[model samples]
Target: TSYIEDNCNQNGAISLIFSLKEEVGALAKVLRLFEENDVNLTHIESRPSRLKKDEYEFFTHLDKRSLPALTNIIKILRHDIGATVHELSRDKKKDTVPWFPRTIQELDRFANQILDADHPGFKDPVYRARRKQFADIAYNYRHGQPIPRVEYMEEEKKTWGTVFKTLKSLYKTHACYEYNHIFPLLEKYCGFHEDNIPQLEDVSQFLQTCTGFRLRPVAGLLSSRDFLGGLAFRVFHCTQYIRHGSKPMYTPEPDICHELLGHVPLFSDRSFAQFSQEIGLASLGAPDEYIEKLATIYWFTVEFGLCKQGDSIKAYGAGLLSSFGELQYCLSEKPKLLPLELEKTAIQNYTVTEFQPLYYVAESFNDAKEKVRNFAATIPRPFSVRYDPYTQRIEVLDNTQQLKILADSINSEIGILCSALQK
Candidate 1:
């Protein structure tokens, strides 16, 4: 998502666009500019510059909005650093100071919030604003839309099996390719090292020892028809010794890649970030019956979400993004793409042996978060929707394995159904 091939051409003031054909040492030049102007940087990212084959786009978010020092410093960069082309980008920041909104104080606050998780006030403006990942992910596309709370009839075996099956198909094993690389990062990045987090008492005494974060068992849904609804975090992690590989490592144990790389990027938006934090913290304390309900909702948004890209709806969810195989399947436009209606989405009975059949499309970032916030309170707890092949898109199916059964389920007579549909 960060390395988008398409350029976001916004007409807003201070908008930046640049192209560097040769190796201009732009970085050294920019750094020099900052030092000369006494300017501070909050975000520094290097991504490939599509305009040039070998050059890169040096992207940085500054501390101040407009500083008098910047004028001269910029001239130095243009003249010395071979900044082939330099353009500025602007953001809508309320004027505290008529000019120079991005003061050194702003940069300091921004950088501190991003690197530290337990810095006194986590909700302060500095932390909230600097967390780039969350800001980018935070937006409310549906400003005034209302979502009805879904209702379900709980069936113990049915609901449990859906939870079991859906997770199995996706997570498969407790381990991932980068488990070794991710755990250390998670410990540092997500505050797992903290003492307040719940660690299972049955695990090693070393692990049982208090830390910044905690581990709480999420009881799987047994009779979830009514319990299913709203945002769900439902954390489920165990110590290496406690896990016998028998329980199949369910609900908890979010490796760094899954929690951070896979899920946290879109969190840049304020609304989305707040929603996720509240939901995740709440799920940590939920029991099995209610947690199961939360899991369904979590699975839909945090794991597998889609978006309106240009004229087509594409996958933007981190879970989908992390998986290479699923990425190819979801974009084909062959199988299924439902309206993202709550009634249709809360179901748990579908045979999900493939890519998702349905995807909730967000008209914008604002819409995505607002949809959850509005219905977060009213969503039925432990609700389960009818499990059907319709849960996943099936146009480019793995094989003809379910052709007849699948065909029978579709109402070709009622709607325009395709016999071997192709884009």
Candidate 2:
């Protein structure tokens, strides 16, 4: 049976929609009738008419057990009060757009990142169970609490070691200057070695010191909007589980190795961290078409992006940095390289199964940040957002009150700068 039918059978709840005349007492009269007849309203909401001024639509829910009383109320509404009433089916489809996470804690709702039949770990029951064990940790996690450490198995450590040893060797030559600069720091502070797997807590702590960027363990892959939302808080929703041991070099989805080894170092750099957050901030409340465009932009810039040194292009994107094979292939003469432009990169298509045939190159990290900031202004969100580090909240700048507060803060900062200049 359908959900509404089941609810009707169990609780006798029903929904209705009604329109009222512009007269001052029209809604009061209808409500008075419902009250006199003892109809129990479970919910009530209203919206102003778009086409006509001084008209409104009210949506309501009531117990169908008061059917006899509701019948009289409906008849009186139509004939006596000159109102229009219609029974609404509660089974109507809900909004299809995926929900955007407003707070960091809401991220736990998206824990079920599934594996398809063709995935290497899909057939391995033990590996699948291990993933569930890891997922549970993220599920139980809450904001402001330490990320619980995972006891790595010997086999998991070996899997990490295999990828780590290979990728570590490539970083010196293939990685960008920013990535290489932060690599040893991670090794020194966070136990980023071939044999040992660092905990999310340690890595997050280290990042907080560098650029205010921190990590949170995610059960699996997040929806495009939700993933970008996390970035606005400077939070990266990372997976705690290791990849399947069968293919040490290959992972169909993101795992710890990809996050720590590839994505973490760049995030340590202030320019790169700010660039990442700008993409995330632009994604708030964006249309589905814009979300696809944003994800493509993310793919080209954050995932597979390349940057220019004095003369040659270098790897900074996490996708290339994590994969030893792709790190070398992306910089070689085989793939087509294009300058990173918002219009061109946003529309570009990529294949997940193979090395990217086309890659976007940025002149530098600062240059890329400027290009992304310019692109973000063109997005069609009604309001802009700023991340408040003290509260760890994304403050929406939608109203005059917020604008005034922001103006005061900016004025105060400018005053401080002016004082410094005088000195």
Top TM-score hit: 2
Model 2 misplacement above 4 A: 1-99, 109-115, 399-406
TM-score against truth, every candidate: 0.31, 0.75
Instruction: Please give the range of 10 consecutive residues that has the lowest summed lDDT in model 2.
Output: 1-10
CA shift of 126, model 2, Å? 2.3
| Candidate 2 residue pairs in backbone clash | none
lDDT of 1 by residue, 1-423 (tens): 111011111322231233344455556656565655655554444455432356555544543444566456556556765453333332224421111111111111111111134333345554334333222321211211221111211232233334334433443222122322343444554443322221232221212132112122221121221112111211122111111122322222232223333443334234444455345433321234335545665566556766554565655565565554565566666656665554445554333335666656655545655655454445332211111122110111112323543565566643554544542
* CA lDDT scores, all candidates in order: 0.36, 0.74
Over 1-423, each residue of candidate 2 has an lDDT whose tens digit, in order, gives 000111113233344445555797866665666667775443455555432467665655454566777667767777787765544332222432223444455444443432367666789998989988998998888778889997888888999988888888878889999988998988888899887999999999999999988898788776676678789878888899988888888788888899997899999999899989988877766666777888888888899899878987898889989988998898789998878888888878777768888998899888887887788788765456666677464554544435666777899999999999998
Candidate 1 has its poorest 10 consecutive residues by lDDT at 96-105
